[PDB]
From a paper:
The complex structure of durvalumab-scFv/PD-L1 was determined by molecular replacement at a resolution of 2.3 Å. The binding of durvalumab to PD-L1 involves both of its heavy chain (VH) and light chain (VL). All of the three complementarity-determining regions (CDRs) of VH and CDR1 and CDR3 of VL contribute to interactions with PD-L1, leaving LCDR2 without any contacts. Here, the binding of durvalumab on PD-L1 was also mainly located on the front β-sheet face which is constituted by A, G, F, C, and C’ strands of the IgV domain of PD-L1. The A, G, and F strands of PD-L1 provide major hydrogen bond interactions with durvalumab. D26 of the A strand and R113 of the F strand of PD-L1 were occupied by S30 of LCDR1 and E58 of HCDR2, respectively. The binding surface of durvalumab and PD-1 on PD-L1 is highly overlapped that residues of PD-L1, which contributed major hydrogen bond interactions with PD-1 (D26, Y123, K124, and R125), were also occupied by durvalumab. Thus, the molecular basis of durvalumab-based PD-1/PD-L1 blockade is that the unbiased binding of durvalumab VH and VL to PD-L1 provides steric clash to abrogate the binding of PD-1/PD-L1. The blockade of avelumab and BMS-936559 to the interaction of PD-1/PD-L1 is mainly contributed by their VH domain while both VH and VL of durvalumab are involved in blockade of PD-1/PD-L1 interaction. On the other hand, the binding of VL does not overlap with that of the nanobody and small-molecule inhibitors. These results indicate that the binding sites of the VH domain of durvalumab may serve as hot spots for small inhibitory biologics development.
Author numbering: 18 to 184, 187 to 214, 218 to 228
Write the structure that this text describes.
């Protein structure tokens, strides 16, 4: 019998990275491309229409002409791999692969797009060197909204101001400002807690 397998049914890819999702099917010896058909679909869009040797670029949807392709070299291994480049949030969802090869079967695959706050840009502004008054800043992009937790070197917790906007856009820009009098050699921490957490360390200079 002919069974399409998705040994990996859940993909968690990071925003902006490349994605390659796979469907396995039985190939007992030399693959015959003339008897092979491969469909890749998402929602109501056709991504790959690989029929009898060649991709039909006419049926395939316009949003994927340049982003998506089927790794042909893999097919001889009984592996139908769809590659999509620079993944966005609207690439998350359900994909269907249909393999026909002397028998037909299809499977579904879930793709999750993760946009974490793990690139934290920090700023240390000296407002008043007399009183050692500083204005610390932590900023990051990610989805969804997140809150920022400021902690001292004794992991005390302090209050700061936080602003959240939108931008790549439909992503969230989160920036927090902490005004505080310090002690050089002191270490502060900004922690981005998303709705786990990533923390940037801010060392006050001499």
């Amino acid at each position: 019998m002919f069974t399409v397998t998705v040994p990996k049914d859940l993909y968690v890819v990071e925003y902006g990275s490349n994605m390659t999702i796979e469907c396995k099917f039985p190939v007992e010896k030399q693959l015959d491309l003339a008897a092979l058909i491969v469909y890749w679909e998402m929602e109501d869009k056709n991504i790959i229409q690989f029929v009898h040797g060649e991709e039909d670029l006419k049926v395939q949807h316009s949003s994927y002409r340049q982003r998506a392709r089927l790794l042909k070299d893999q097919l001889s291994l009984g592996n139908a791999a769809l590659q999509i480049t620079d993944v966005k949030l609207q690439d998350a969802g359900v994909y269907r692969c249909m393999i026909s090869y002397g028998g037909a079967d299809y499977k579904r695959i879930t793709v999750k797009v993760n946009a974490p706050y793990n690139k934290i840009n920090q700023r240390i502004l000296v407002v008043d060197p007399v009183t050692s008054e500083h204005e610390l800043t932590c900023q990051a992009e990610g989805y969804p909204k997140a809150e920022v937790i400021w902690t001292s070197s004794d992991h005390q917790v302090l209050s700061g101001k936080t602003t959240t906007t939108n931008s790549e856009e439909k992503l969230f820009n989160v920036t927090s400002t902490l005004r505080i009098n310090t002690t050089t050699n002191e270490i502060f921490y900004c922690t981005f807690r998303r709705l786990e957490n990533h923390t940037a360390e801010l060392v006050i200079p001499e």
